[PDB]
């Protein structure tokens, strides 16, 4: 029985080494690793690989790894898929704690805007939760953690996160944890996955996906939102991505409205994470 060497990226950094049998379906891969994690909530959770035009594509878990990766290596991260609306309903502590690592890559990467308070406060959470209560003999006037906090790090950011881990004194993992998700989840651009499109007249959007619906990133002055509800049908076809929706009460029909995404394959991985979004999202 021939298997196949995986390498995972982790969410604190680190690499997972195993192997699968060759013609093994991701959710084969999946459990092993959220094993290796100790993770249980597994819903929320799923591997990435880069395409052979180095885009970031969702392993499938019901379909063979080797009809994804193609001609790629069998190289993975470890992901937040569906971002919780209330981190707080969820059952365990390690989810959240692996939901707060992403959510550290997602602002440290700049996918995730975050005005100079908020960096320094869900920072101040973080060191909280990983050095414990507030200790002056590691910390002098010109301290600079460890810790990436922000896309661009400035003597005033390490200061104000010193300042608010003072304040935390007391505070165990799991509490600083759940403070740090509190503020998170409240970030505009919060479990947003951005797709980059033109509309119907050319003119260039982002269409953003998450667990409320389809953002539509216009001009910064005019956002459409289309909650699930209202998203009646989604579809693809060659460049182009489609979605009917809602007809307003005593309106006879249907509305639709089209994107052109860069290429057939970035309208397909769209109308996948949307279907998985609107699914995820209706049973939740
Ligand atoms: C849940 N929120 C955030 C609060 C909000 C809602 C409406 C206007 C301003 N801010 C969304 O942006 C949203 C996403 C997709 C569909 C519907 C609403």
């Known amino acids: 029985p021939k298997s196949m060497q995986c390498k ?56 063979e790894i080797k009809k994804q990766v193609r001609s790629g290596a069998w190289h993975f991260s470890f992901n937040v898929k569906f971002y919780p609306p209330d981190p707080a309903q969820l059952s365990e502590d390690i989810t959240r704690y692996y939901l707060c690592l992403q959510l550290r890559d997602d602002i440290v990467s700049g996918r995730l805007p975050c005005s100079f308070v908020t960096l320094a406060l869900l920072g101040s959470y973080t060191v909280q939760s990983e050095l414990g209560d507030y200790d002056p003999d590691e910390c002098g006037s010109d301290y600079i953690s460890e810790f990436r906090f922000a896309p661009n790090h400035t003597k005033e950011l390490e200061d104000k996160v010193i300042e608010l881990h003072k304040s935390h004194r007391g505070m165990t993992p799991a509490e600083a944890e759940m403070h740090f998700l509190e503020n998170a989840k409240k970030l505009s651009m919060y479990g947003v996955d951005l797709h980059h499109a033109k509309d119907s007249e050319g003119v260039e959007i982002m269409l953003g996906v998450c667990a409320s619906g389809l953002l539509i990133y216009r001009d910064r002055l005019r956002i459409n939102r289309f909650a699930w509800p209202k998203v009646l049908k989604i579809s693809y076809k060659r460049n182009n991505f489609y979605i009917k929706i809602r007809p307003g009460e005593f309106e006879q029909f249907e509305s639709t409205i089209g994107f052109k995404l860069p290429n057939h394959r970035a309208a397909k991985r769209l109308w996948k994470v949307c279907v998985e979004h609107h699914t995820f999202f209706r049973l939740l």
């Open 8 to 63: 995972v990226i982790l969410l604190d950094g680190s690499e997972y080494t195993c192997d699968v049998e060759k013609r093994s379906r991701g959710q084969v891969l999946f459990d092993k690793v959220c094993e290796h994690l100790n993770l249980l909530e597994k819903d929320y959770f799923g591997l990435t690989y880069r395409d052979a035009e180095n885009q970031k594509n969702w392993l499938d878990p019901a379909k």
